[PDB]
Amino acid sequence: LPDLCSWEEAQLSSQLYRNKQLQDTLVQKEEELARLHEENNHLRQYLNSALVKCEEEKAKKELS
Amino acid sequence: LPDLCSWEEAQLSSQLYRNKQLQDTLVQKEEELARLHEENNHLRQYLNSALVKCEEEKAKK
């Protein structure tokens, strides 16, 4: 029992360490995701806004 | 001692399960990031192309 207990405790420490590393990576990923979602959406909006104005201009020009 | 051992065993089990969950979440997050990076690049490419064409249309005379 005491040799098993010491082995189990070491495995637990190693597991908690690996999980902490995963957890930290996951925080970094979530914020990278949030950044990209916001940038993609804004870029999308900007493109749509500019392209629409280009077409509005052609419409009112090409009427006479 | 015997109380600590059972607590540590139960924690090994919970933490193995936690590891799996974190691993599963991470593969899903990486897939999502890979797609958003692809989209971001395409959006920047499209933007560049639209700036050029916007500019060339200002061949205004």
Residue numbers in the entry:
A (entry chain A): 69 to 132
B (entry chain B): 69 to 129
Quote from the publication.
Geminin coiled-coil domain-containing protein 1, GemC1, is a member of the Geminin superfamily. The three members of this family, Geminin, Idas and GemC1, all share a conserved coiled-coil domain. GemC1 has been identified as a Geminin homologue, and is also implicated in DNA replication but at a later stage than Geminin. GemC1 has been shown to mediate TopBP1- and Cdk2-dependent recruitment of Cdc45 onto replication origins, enabling pre-initiation complex formation and initiation of DNA replication.
To better understand this family of proteins, the crystal structure of a GemC1 coiled-coil domain variant engineered for better solubility was determined to 2.2 Å resolution. In particular, at the C-terminal end of the coiled coil, residues Leu119, Val120, Leu123, Ala127, Leu130 and Leu131 constitute a hydrophobic patch. We thus decided to mutate residues Leu123 and Leu130 to glutamates to increase the solubility. Our mutations yielded the construct tGemC1L123,130E, which allowed the expression of highly soluble protein (>2 mM). Residues 71–129 and 70–124 are in α-helical conformation in each chain. The two mutated leucine residues are indeed pointing to the solvent, as expected from our sequence analysis and in contrast to the other predictions discussed above. Based on our structural data, we conclude that the change of the hydrophobic solvent-exposed Leu123 and Leu130 to hydrophilic glutamate residues improved solubility without affecting the global structure. Analysis of the structure using the SOCKET software shows that the coiled-coil region extends from residues 73 to 115 and spans six heptads (technically speaking, one residue of a seventh heptad is present). Analysis of the coiled-coil parameters by the program CCCP shows that the GemC1 coiled coil has an ω0 angle of −4.1° per residue, suggesting a relatively tight left-handed superhelix compared with the Geminin homodimer (ω0 = −3.9° per residue) and Idas–Geminin (ω0 = −3.7° per residue). The superhelical radius (the distance from the superhelix axis to the helical axis of the chains) is longer in GemC1 at 5.1 Å compared with 4.7 Å for both Geminin and Idas–Geminin.
